[PDB]
Amino acid sequence: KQNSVFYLLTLGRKPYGSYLHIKIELDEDEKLEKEIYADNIKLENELRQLKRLYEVYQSVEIDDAQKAIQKEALLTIAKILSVFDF
Amino acid sequence: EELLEKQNSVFYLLTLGSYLHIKIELDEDEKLEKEIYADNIKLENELRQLKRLYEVYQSVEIDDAQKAIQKEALLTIAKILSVFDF
Amino acid sequence: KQNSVFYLLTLGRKPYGSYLHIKIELDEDEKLEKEIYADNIKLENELRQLKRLYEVYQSVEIDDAQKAIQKEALLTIAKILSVFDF
Amino acid sequence: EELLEKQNSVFYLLTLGSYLHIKIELDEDEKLEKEIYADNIKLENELRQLKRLYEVYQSVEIDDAQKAIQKEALLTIAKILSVFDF
Amino acid sequence: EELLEKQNSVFYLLTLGSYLHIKIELDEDEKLEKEIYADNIKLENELRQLKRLYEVYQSVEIDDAQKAIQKEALLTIAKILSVFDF
Amino acid sequence: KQNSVFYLLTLGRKPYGSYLHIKIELDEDEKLEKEIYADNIKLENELRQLKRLYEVYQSVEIDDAQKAIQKEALLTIAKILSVFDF
Amino acid sequence: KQNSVFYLLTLGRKPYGSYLHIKIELDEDEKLEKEIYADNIKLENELRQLKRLYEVYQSVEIDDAQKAIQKEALLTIAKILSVFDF
Amino acid sequence: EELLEKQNSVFYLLTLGSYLHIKIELDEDEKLEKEIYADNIKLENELRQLKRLYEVYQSVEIDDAQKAIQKEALLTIAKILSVFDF
Amino acid sequence: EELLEKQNSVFYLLTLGSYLHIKIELDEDEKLEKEIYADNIKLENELRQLKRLYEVYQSVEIDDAQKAIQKEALLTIAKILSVFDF
Amino acid sequence: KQNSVFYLLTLGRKPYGSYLHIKIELDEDEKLEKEIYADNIKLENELRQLKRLYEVYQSVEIDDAQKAIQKEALLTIAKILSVFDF
Amino acid sequence: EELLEKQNSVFYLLTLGSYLHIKIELDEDEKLEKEIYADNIKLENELRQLKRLYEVYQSVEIDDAQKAIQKEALLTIAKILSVFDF
Amino acid sequence: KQNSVFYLLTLGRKPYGSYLHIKIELDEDEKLEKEIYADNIKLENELRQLKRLYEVYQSVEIDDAQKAIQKEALLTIAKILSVFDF
């Protein structure tokens, strides 16, 4: 099986604080992109967020949200990467 | 209005008891790649590993090590992705 | 503001156990429908599931999943109703 | 192949400090309707209320009370919906 | 010097593994009466049942239910009496 | 075996607060009667009081107090009734 | 104020075990007397028994049992004495 | 049918912030007598004191000390009596 | 410049499953001497014994007992020495 | 085997507080002697100190400190003696 | 009779609020050297740092990182030495 | 101030297991040397051993053991080094 995840992360500084532009190309078909305020990202929270997103992703029934939770995990992982990569 | 400070690219190519190949291109310069036994990949362990890698990454004196821990994080993050994507 | 939720719940018995056909008309626009095996529904689990779905729904960023989590809550609430209504 | 045992319709019409009107049509025969102060609706409380209502509902001797507790649950569930839908 | 506000009569007729008949006349208008298996009447359980019945009785919206919970309490209290009186 | 307990409870209001006149006819032979100040009766306390009165009643040796503890339980139960019946 | 308590304790040995004849003259008016099997008296229990008897004695209302609890304490204290005096 | 092994007489004469005189005749041979400040006599402390005196009394090598601890117990028991008798 | 208040001599002669003879000369006036089974001498127990002996020694009314507890401490201390010296 | 420990303890009072002159003759060959300020000796600490000194003494490897820990235990025991002997 | 597998030389030169210079020669090939603020060197922290560095060192995939963590340990150990040596 | 610690560690393999020859030159004056069996060294134990050795080293009084504890710490640190360096 295959899975490609491209993470492109850009930290921009604005007059108010630093912002993290997150671009994520899931399987070369879906682009996701979001701009978080970077300064208040705390690894522990994000690791917990992942714990919960898994708890839900494996107990979720619809033919819908098993992709819509996967994406939130991917964003959450972007934020984690930002912590280690800067 | 805003100024770019840095950019970070992480390319995750993941190819799947179960046995997992990991390819990571950090910043289009480093390739990292490894094979692992996927049966005993347990999210909680990997989240804890990240918690510890962070604890060390932010208390580590050497300019270098930070990078050698960053890479471990990146691998640890691969395993986490494998959980959500399969 | 307004919100309509229609819950239509039908318990059918099959040779193997009872099944709960859940039909949910959110805001007279979306129909959701699913068929759960009814016999192994435990209120406590479902109350916890709601706790988590809220934890995620209020910390979720995308313009996507704030509806895709709402729906899972709605299904989870159907199962809770089934417990009180039979 | 399967046989219908029962059907249950619950119609939730919810209309919104904040002050909340609740209308519930149980089984197209009973209407229940109430007004409440929405500022201090806290999900955890309402989940616990359900836990207790269940504890009583399944230990309650009277044929009747079960129905009078069912209705309380239904109202409690309205408040929970209000949290997720607004 | 003082004014009577209300009066309440509760008549407990209890007649006795062991199997227990309960007759209760509430307020000289309602009779309640039931049979139960007395071996597994455990005071702690019955005290906890009262704790819960109260928790619900004082949070219950319906004018009616209060009465349907009151009756359960009265039965629960019968079992407690049976413990002390035999 | 038989046991009759008659509970007659009257709430009177005096200038200072409400008072609960308790009249209890144990087995149509003993009358007990007491006037408690009603406003500071807390179910939890009274349930604990019962727990203790049982602990003592089942470990008590004399040919005396197994009736003199039974009576205190009966009063304590009156107070509990007052909570549910008003 | 005055209070006299006379404790006369006699340990007799019978074919089956030792028995503790307890004679207690409260205030030179009341004699209490009981014969306990001595071999299974455990200080901790008796100290707890006292703890409870106090909890009850100070929360007891009737014009009755404040003497009928006092007596049980006195017996309980006899058993404690037997432990230290043999 | 049974044989007397020993007899023990303990005579407690107690005479009452509050200040307490204690007279104890052990076995009609020893008199012990003391004065104490009764405001801060707290049952729990005295029960714990007994627990400790026992712990030592039953681990004490000297033939004598046992008696010197017995006496302390007897005084401690006086204070306990004072609580129940006043 | 300083004034001597008191002097205390303690002479420990210890002679060694294992079986231990203890000789103690307190203050060159009292000899204490005992034999014990050394296999089950466990430091923690002996430290706890000291903790308790102190608790009693400092709450003990009799002028005498203090001395009878002091001696027990001294023996307990012998066992502790035996642990460290062998 | 043999072991002699002589404890000679002298409490002197100086203008500033009491001082405890400790003289310890281990095995009639080693004299140890020290002057502690006596007023701040707390049994619990010293019992813990012993606990630790044992933990170390039984896990210590060198041909050196198994005598240099023994001595510290001996001093620590002097302080304990001072507590019981004054 | 025995065979040498490896040898490791670590040379610690430590030179001393307080401010600490550290020089370490690992294996006579690498020099590591750093300056630190010694007031807030707290042994417990440094022991915990070692616990974590080990946890990572033994779970680290890269052949290299192991060495970059080894060095951190060595520095952490310097601080520990400074505590004991000054 | 200055302090030199030279660690020379050699792992030899014998028929029975690996042995760690530890040579430690404290301040170019004292040599310490010991041969531990290497295979049963557990970091956690050794970190605890250090914790205790500090607890003792800072509460130790004699003009003796503040060097004889320092040495045990130094050995204990050798064992820790062996863990990171092999």
Short mmCIF file of N, CA and C in Angstrom, two decimals, chain C residues 1-16 18-19 21 35 43-44 47 50-51 53-54 57 69-70 73-74 77 80-81 83-86, chain D residues 1-16 26 28 43-44 47-48 50-51 53-54 57 66 69-70 73-74 77 80-81 83-86:
data_model
loop_
_atom_site.label_atom_id
_atom_site.label_comp_id
_atom_site.label_asym_id
_atom_site.label_seq_id
_atom_site.Cartn_x
_atom_site.Cartn_y
_atom_site.Cartn_z
N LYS C 1 -32.13 31.50 16.48
CA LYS C 1 -31.56 30.44 15.60
C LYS C 1 -32.41 29.18 15.64
N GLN C 2 -32.31 28.34 14.60
CA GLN C 2 -33.02 27.09 14.64
C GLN C 2 -32.23 25.87 14.25
N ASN C 3 -32.68 24.75 14.79
CA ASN C 3 -32.09 23.47 14.54
C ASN C 3 -33.21 22.49 14.73
N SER C 4 -33.36 21.60 13.75
CA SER C 4 -34.32 20.54 13.83
C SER C 4 -33.46 19.31 13.78
N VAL C 5 -33.77 18.36 14.66
CA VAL C 5 -33.24 17.01 14.56
C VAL C 5 -34.40 16.09 14.72
N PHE C 6 -34.56 15.25 13.70
CA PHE C 6 -35.55 14.21 13.69
C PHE C 6 -34.79 12.94 13.92
N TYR C 7 -35.22 12.23 14.95
CA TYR C 7 -34.75 10.88 15.18
C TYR C 7 -35.84 9.87 14.89
N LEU C 8 -35.60 8.99 13.90
CA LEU C 8 -36.43 7.80 13.69
C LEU C 8 -35.59 6.56 13.92
N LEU C 9 -35.97 5.82 14.96
CA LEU C 9 -35.25 4.65 15.41
C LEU C 9 -36.12 3.42 15.32
N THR C 10 -35.62 2.39 14.69
CA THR C 10 -36.37 1.17 14.54
C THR C 10 -35.51 0.05 15.00
N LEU C 11 -36.00 -0.73 15.95
CA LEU C 11 -35.36 -1.94 16.36
C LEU C 11 -35.95 -3.13 15.55
N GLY C 12 -35.16 -3.74 14.68
CA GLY C 12 -35.53 -5.00 14.02
C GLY C 12 -34.82 -6.19 14.65
N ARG C 13 -35.50 -7.34 14.75
CA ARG C 13 -34.83 -8.55 15.20
C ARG C 13 -34.57 -9.45 14.02
N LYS C 14 -33.30 -9.82 13.90
CA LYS C 14 -32.81 -10.76 12.92
C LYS C 14 -32.46 -12.07 13.67
N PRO C 15 -32.27 -13.18 12.91
CA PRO C 15 -31.86 -14.46 13.52
C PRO C 15 -30.64 -14.36 14.48
N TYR C 16 -29.77 -13.37 14.28
CA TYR C 16 -28.49 -13.23 15.01
C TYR C 16 -28.52 -12.31 16.23
N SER C 18 -30.72 -8.33 17.73
CA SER C 18 -31.44 -7.14 17.36
C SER C 18 -30.54 -6.04 16.69
N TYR C 19 -31.09 -5.34 15.70
CA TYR C 19 -30.38 -4.31 14.93
C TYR C 19 -31.18 -3.04 15.02
N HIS C 21 -31.98 0.50 13.40
CA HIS C 21 -31.90 1.27 12.19
C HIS C 21 -32.12 2.68 12.66
N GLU C 35 -27.18 1.28 10.46
CA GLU C 35 -27.76 0.11 11.03
C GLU C 35 -26.71 -0.46 11.95
N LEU C 43 -24.44 2.51 27.65
CA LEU C 43 -24.54 3.91 27.91
C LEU C 43 -23.18 4.51 28.28
N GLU C 44 -22.46 3.98 29.28
CA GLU C 44 -21.25 4.68 29.71
C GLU C 44 -20.35 4.98 28.54
N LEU C 47 -21.63 7.86 26.54
CA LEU C 47 -21.43 9.15 27.21
C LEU C 47 -19.97 9.62 27.15
N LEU C 50 -19.33 10.91 23.61
CA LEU C 50 -19.75 12.28 23.52
C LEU C 50 -18.76 13.25 24.13
N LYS C 51 -18.18 12.88 25.27
CA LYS C 51 -17.23 13.75 25.97
C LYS C 51 -16.06 14.05 25.03
N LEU C 53 -15.94 13.57 21.61
CA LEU C 53 -16.38 14.28 20.45
C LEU C 53 -16.52 15.76 20.72
N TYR C 54 -16.94 16.15 21.92
CA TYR C 54 -16.93 17.57 22.22
C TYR C 54 -15.51 18.13 22.33
N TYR C 57 -14.44 18.62 18.89
CA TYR C 57 -15.26 19.57 18.12
C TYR C 57 -14.95 21.04 18.45
N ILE C 69 -18.07 15.97 12.70
CA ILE C 69 -18.03 15.56 14.11
C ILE C 69 -19.43 15.73 14.64
N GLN C 70 -20.08 16.83 14.28
CA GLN C 70 -21.46 17.00 14.68
C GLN C 70 -22.33 15.76 14.34
N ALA C 73 -21.82 12.83 16.59
CA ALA C 73 -22.43 13.07 17.88
C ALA C 73 -23.87 12.73 17.78
N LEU C 74 -24.48 13.21 16.71
CA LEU C 74 -25.86 12.86 16.43
C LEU C 74 -26.05 11.35 16.40
N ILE C 77 -25.78 10.08 19.88
CA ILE C 77 -26.98 10.37 20.63
C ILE C 77 -28.18 9.43 20.25
N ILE C 80 -27.93 6.51 22.39
CA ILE C 80 -28.32 6.81 23.75
C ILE C 80 -29.83 6.80 23.88
N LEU C 81 -30.49 7.40 22.91
CA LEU C 81 -31.94 7.41 22.89
C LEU C 81 -32.46 5.96 22.90
N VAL C 83 -31.38 3.38 24.18
CA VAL C 83 -31.33 2.85 25.53
C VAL C 83 -32.49 3.28 26.42
N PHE C 84 -32.92 4.52 26.29
CA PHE C 84 -33.98 5.03 27.14
C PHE C 84 -35.38 4.75 26.60
N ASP C 85 -35.46 4.47 25.30
CA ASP C 85 -36.73 4.39 24.64
C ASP C 85 -37.17 2.97 24.41
N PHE C 86 -36.40 1.97 24.87
CA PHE C 86 -36.75 0.55 24.72
C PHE C 86 -36.50 -0.24 26.01
N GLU D 1 -36.73 -11.11 6.15
CA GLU D 1 -35.66 -11.84 6.81
C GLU D 1 -35.53 -11.40 8.25
N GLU D 2 -35.96 -10.17 8.52
CA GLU D 2 -35.91 -9.60 9.85
C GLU D 2 -37.24 -9.00 10.20
N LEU D 3 -37.52 -8.88 11.48
CA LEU D 3 -38.83 -8.46 11.93
C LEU D 3 -38.78 -7.23 12.81
N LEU D 4 -39.62 -6.25 12.53
CA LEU D 4 -39.61 -4.99 13.26
C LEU D 4 -40.28 -5.18 14.56
N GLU D 5 -39.66 -4.65 15.60
CA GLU D 5 -40.15 -4.90 16.90
C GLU D 5 -40.81 -3.65 17.39
N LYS D 6 -40.19 -2.52 17.15
CA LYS D 6 -40.69 -1.25 17.61
C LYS D 6 -40.01 -0.12 16.85
N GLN D 7 -40.67 0.99 16.90
CA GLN D 7 -40.21 2.26 16.36
C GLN D 7 -40.44 3.44 17.32
N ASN D 8 -39.52 4.37 17.23
CA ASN D 8 -39.42 5.45 18.17
C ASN D 8 -39.06 6.70 17.36
N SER D 9 -39.85 7.74 17.54
CA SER D 9 -39.57 8.96 16.81
C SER D 9 -39.30 9.99 17.88
N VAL D 10 -38.23 10.73 17.70
CA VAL D 10 -37.99 11.86 18.58
C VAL D 10 -37.68 13.08 17.75
N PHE D 11 -38.54 14.06 17.92
CA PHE D 11 -38.37 15.28 17.19
C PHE D 11 -37.91 16.43 18.07
N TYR D 12 -36.70 16.88 17.76
CA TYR D 12 -36.07 17.94 18.52
C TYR D 12 -36.12 19.27 17.75
N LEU D 13 -36.96 20.15 18.27
CA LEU D 13 -36.95 21.53 17.79
C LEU D 13 -36.39 22.50 18.84
N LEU D 14 -35.22 23.04 18.52
CA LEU D 14 -34.49 23.83 19.47
C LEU D 14 -34.34 25.22 18.95
N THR D 15 -34.77 26.17 19.77
CA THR D 15 -34.71 27.55 19.38
C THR D 15 -34.06 28.36 20.45
N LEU D 16 -32.93 28.97 20.09
CA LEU D 16 -32.22 29.88 20.99
C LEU D 16 -32.69 31.38 20.93
N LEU D 26 -42.19 13.34 21.31
CA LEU D 26 -41.90 11.92 21.49
C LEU D 26 -42.98 11.16 20.78
N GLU D 28 -44.63 11.09 18.16
CA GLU D 28 -45.79 11.78 17.55
C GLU D 28 -47.07 11.80 18.41
N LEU D 43 -21.79 20.60 29.38
CA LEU D 43 -21.83 19.25 28.92
C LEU D 43 -21.54 18.23 30.04
N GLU D 44 -20.43 18.36 30.78
CA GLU D 44 -20.10 17.30 31.74
C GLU D 44 -21.28 17.03 32.66
N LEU D 47 -23.88 15.07 30.90
CA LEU D 47 -23.53 13.66 30.71
C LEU D 47 -23.70 12.85 31.98
N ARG D 48 -23.49 13.51 33.10
CA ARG D 48 -23.53 12.84 34.42
C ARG D 48 -24.98 12.63 34.78
N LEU D 50 -27.30 12.13 32.66
CA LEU D 50 -27.71 10.95 31.94
C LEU D 50 -27.25 9.68 32.63
N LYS D 51 -26.04 9.69 33.15
CA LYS D 51 -25.51 8.48 33.80
C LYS D 51 -26.42 8.11 34.97
N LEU D 53 -29.69 9.23 35.51
CA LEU D 53 -31.01 8.89 35.04
C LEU D 53 -30.99 7.43 34.59
N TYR D 54 -29.93 6.98 33.93
CA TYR D 54 -29.95 5.59 33.54
C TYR D 54 -29.94 4.67 34.76
N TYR D 57 -33.27 4.53 35.98
CA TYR D 57 -34.26 4.01 35.03
C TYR D 57 -34.24 2.51 35.01
N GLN D 66 -40.52 4.80 34.74
CA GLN D 66 -39.65 4.63 33.59
C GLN D 66 -39.91 5.67 32.53
N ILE D 69 -38.90 9.21 33.66
CA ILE D 69 -37.43 9.36 33.66
C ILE D 69 -37.01 9.43 32.19
N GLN D 70 -37.64 8.64 31.34
CA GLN D 70 -37.35 8.75 29.94
C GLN D 70 -37.46 10.21 29.48
N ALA D 73 -34.68 12.39 30.44
CA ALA D 73 -33.50 12.08 29.67
C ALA D 73 -33.61 12.85 28.39
N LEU D 74 -34.78 12.78 27.79
CA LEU D 74 -34.99 13.47 26.53
C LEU D 74 -34.69 14.95 26.66
N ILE D 77 -31.05 15.39 26.98
CA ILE D 77 -30.44 15.25 25.67
C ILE D 77 -30.62 16.51 24.80
N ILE D 80 -27.85 18.79 25.50
CA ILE D 80 -26.62 18.31 24.93
C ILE D 80 -26.54 18.65 23.44
N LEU D 81 -27.67 18.53 22.78
CA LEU D 81 -27.74 18.86 21.38
C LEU D 81 -27.41 20.34 21.21
N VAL D 83 -25.56 22.26 22.80
CA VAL D 83 -24.13 22.48 22.83
C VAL D 83 -23.46 22.24 21.48
N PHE D 84 -23.84 21.16 20.81
CA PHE D 84 -23.15 20.74 19.58
C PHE D 84 -23.61 21.46 18.34
N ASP D 85 -24.79 22.05 18.43
CA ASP D 85 -25.44 22.57 17.26
C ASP D 85 -25.29 24.06 17.15
N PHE D 86 -24.71 24.70 18.17
CA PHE D 86 -24.59 26.15 18.20
C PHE D 86 -23.13 26.56 18.50
#
